[PDB]
């Protein structure tokens, strides 16, 4: 037998014998993740056991799309698949999927808690924009980027873990919704720069060490948006739905706080000329990402040209060729659970 079983993270992992000393590092609706030592490669890996991938079609579609995209994308800021396996021997008995990834050291939530340092902050944001640009060039518009879905190594290298809605913006989760763009929440449709709002939310959270737009539901979240950024222009209420406009237009009108008041100098490293320069540049970039109307919001390509980020720009990292997803009808075609299962089983078997 090439497999062995170990109970870890209150779950039974049945894995290849090359993977040793499993230790829980994370959990969620998608699955349970362990760190492990891979004796074949002499390196530490992360193993994700997918949680109930065939419980329904949303789980099955998510599992198939995650597996296909993690194989096909090859980029330093997107997590890569090192191995995938199932311990079951037939399609009839097939139930469990294990993804093996390179082990990162922390997620971005943990990193966000550290004291803001402009070299680290700008580098993390640069890498996020690099990964997002690469996903966008393949038609993958994430729409649910959040700090828990982004992992970081001790040397501050950064990888995005998941693909959001991919080449599909309704999201049935069955969650953390504080990073979703106004045009997603309000049901207006989206373009590529929907993901820039989420980066802006993460960036503002790195500076304030508080969630920018927290709240129990989207009603509360929208109130936090307009209180801080101001009631949007009627050119936006016009693009808005004639029904949902009524609630939004009848909210109290807010001027919004200026970005100097939203992100005051008190939040930034002080008392060097370099730090004074960088506070102004960071606030300027925030003011161009945290824009309610996506028609007025900076693009990924222009954010990479912004002076706060562009110090890091290397064409070899930014301008890599787009992945060719030959598997069309992905994120559009629906299938029965049995059909998704066969599709996933073929992908696991390579
Ligand atoms: C303060 C919270 C308000 C929540 C408002 C809920 C709004 C309901 C959304 C329905 C919009 C459907 N259409 C217009 C067809 C666009 C669908 C395309 S996409 O899904 O927006 O990409
Ligand atoms: O946390 C989750 N997913 C993850 N996927 N990969 C992860 C990882 C962690 C550390 N190093 C490498 C990879 S954690 C979830 F299941 F709750 Br959606």
UniProtKB/Swiss-Prot annotation:
Post-translational modification: Weakly autophosphorylated on threonine and tyrosine residues in vitro. Palmitoylation regulates subcellular location and axonal development.
Keywords from the named record: ATP-binding, Biological rhythms, Chromosomal rearrangement, Cytoplasm, Epilepsy, Intellectual disability, Kinase, Lipoprotein, Membrane, Mitochondrion, Nucleotide-binding, Nucleus, Palmitate, Phosphoprotein, Serine/threonine-protein kinase, Transferase
Cofactor(s) for this UniProt protein: Mg(2+)
Active site feature: 144
Main location group: cytoplasm
Expression sites (tissue/organ): Specific to a subset of neurons in the nervous system. Present in the hippocampus and areas, cerebellum, striatum, brain stem, and weakly in the spinal cord. Very weak expression in testis and kidney.
GO molecular function list: ATP binding; JUN kinase activity; MAP kinase kinase activity; protein serine kinase activity
Bilayer disposition of the protein: Lipid-anchor
Residue window of motif TXY: 173-174
EC number(s) per entry: 2.7.11.24
UniProt activity-regulation remark: Activated by threonine and tyrosine phosphorylation by two dual specificity kinases, MAP2K4 and MAP2K7. MAP2K7 phosphorylates MAPK10 on Thr-173 causing a conformational change and a large increase in Vmax. Inhibited by dual specificity phosphatases, such as DUSP1. Inhibited by HDAC9.
Residue(s) carrying Phosphothreonine: 173
Subcellular location: Cytoplasm; Membrane; Nucleus; Mitochondrion
Reactions this protein catalyses: L-seryl-[protein] + ATP = O-phospho-L-seryl-[protein] + ADP + H(+); L-threonyl-[protein] + ATP = O-phospho-L-threonyl-[protein] + ADP + H(+)
Binding residues annotated for ATP, in chain numbering: 25-33, 48
GO biological process: cellular senescence; Fc-epsilon receptor signaling pathway; JNK cascade; protein phosphorylation; regulation of circadian rhythm; response to light stimulus; rhythmic process; signal transduction
Subunit structure: Interacts with MAPKBP1. Interacts with MAPK8IP1/JIP-1 and MAPK8IP3/JIP-3/JSAP1. Interacts with SPAG9/MAPK8IP4/JIP4. Interacts with HDAC9. Interacts with ARRB2; the interaction enhances MAPK10 activation by MAP3K5. Interacts with SARM1. Interacts with JUND; interaction is inhibited in the presence of MEN1.
Main function: Serine/threonine-protein kinase involved in various processes such as neuronal proliferation, differentiation, migration and programmed cell death. Extracellular stimuli such as pro-inflammatory cytokines or physical stress stimulate the stress-activated protein kinase/c-Jun N-terminal kinase (SAP/JNK) signaling pathway. In this cascade, two dual specificity kinases MAP2K4/MKK4 and MAP2K7/MKK7 phosphorylate and activate MAPK10/JNK3.
Family the entry assigns: Belongs to the protein kinase superfamily. CMGC Ser/Thr protein kinase family. MAP kinase subfamily.
Recorded disease: A chromosomal aberration involving MAPK10 has been found in a single patient with pharmacoresistant epileptic encephalopathy. Translocation t(Y;4)(q11.2;q21) which causes MAPK10 truncation.
Domain notes: The TXY motif contains the threonine and tyrosine residues whose phosphorylation activates the MAP kinases.
Listed name of the protein: Mitogen-activated protein kinase 10
Organism: Homo sapiens (Human)
Part of the whole protein covered: 46 to 400 of 464
């Amino acid at each position: 037998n090439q497999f062995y079983s170990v109970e870890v993270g209150d779950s039974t992992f049945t894995v290849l014998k090359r993977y040793q000393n499993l230790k829980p590092i994370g959990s969620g609706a998608q699955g349970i993740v362990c760190a492990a030592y891979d004796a074949v490669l002499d390196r530490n890996v992360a193993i994700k056991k997918l949680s109930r991938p065939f419980q329904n079609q949303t789980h099955a579609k998510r599992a198939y799309r995650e597996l296909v995209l993690m194989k096909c994308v090859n980029h330093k800021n997107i997590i890569s698949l090192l191995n995938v396996f199932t311990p079951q021997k037939t399609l009839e008995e097939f139930q469990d999927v294990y993804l093996v990834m390179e082990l990162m050291d922390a997620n971005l939530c943990q990193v966000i808690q550290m004291e803001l340092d402009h070299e680290r902050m700008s580098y993390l944001l640069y890498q996020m924009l690099c990964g997002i640009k690469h996903l966008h060039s393949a038609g993958i518009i994430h729409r649910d980027l959040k700090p828990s879905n982004i992992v970081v190594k001790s040397d501050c290298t950064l990888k995005i873990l998941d693909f959001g809605l991919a080449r599909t913006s309704f999201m049935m989760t069955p969650v953390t919704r504080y990073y979703r763009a106004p045009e997603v929440i309000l049901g207006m449709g989206y373009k590529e720069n929907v993901d820039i709002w989420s980066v802006g939310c993460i960036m503002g959270e790195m500076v304030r060490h508080k969630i920018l737009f927290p709240g129990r539901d989207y009603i509360d979240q929208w109130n936090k948006v307009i209180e801080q950024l101001g009631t949007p222009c009627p050119e936006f209420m016009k693009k808005l739905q004639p029904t949902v406009r009524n609630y939004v237009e009848n909210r109290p009108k807010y001027a919004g706080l200026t970005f100097p008041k939203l992100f005051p100098d008190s939040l930034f490293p002080a008392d060097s000329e370099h730090n004074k320069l960088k506070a102004s540049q960071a606030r300027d970039l925030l003011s161009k990402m945290l824009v309610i109307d996506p028609a007025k919001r900076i693009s990924v390509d222009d954010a990479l040209q912004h002076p706060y980020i562009n110090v890091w720009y290397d064409p070899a990292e930014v301008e890599a060729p787009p992945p060719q997803i030959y598997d069309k009808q992905l994120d559009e075609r629906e299938h029965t659970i049995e059909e998704w299962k066969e599709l996933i089983y073929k992908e696991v078997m390579n």
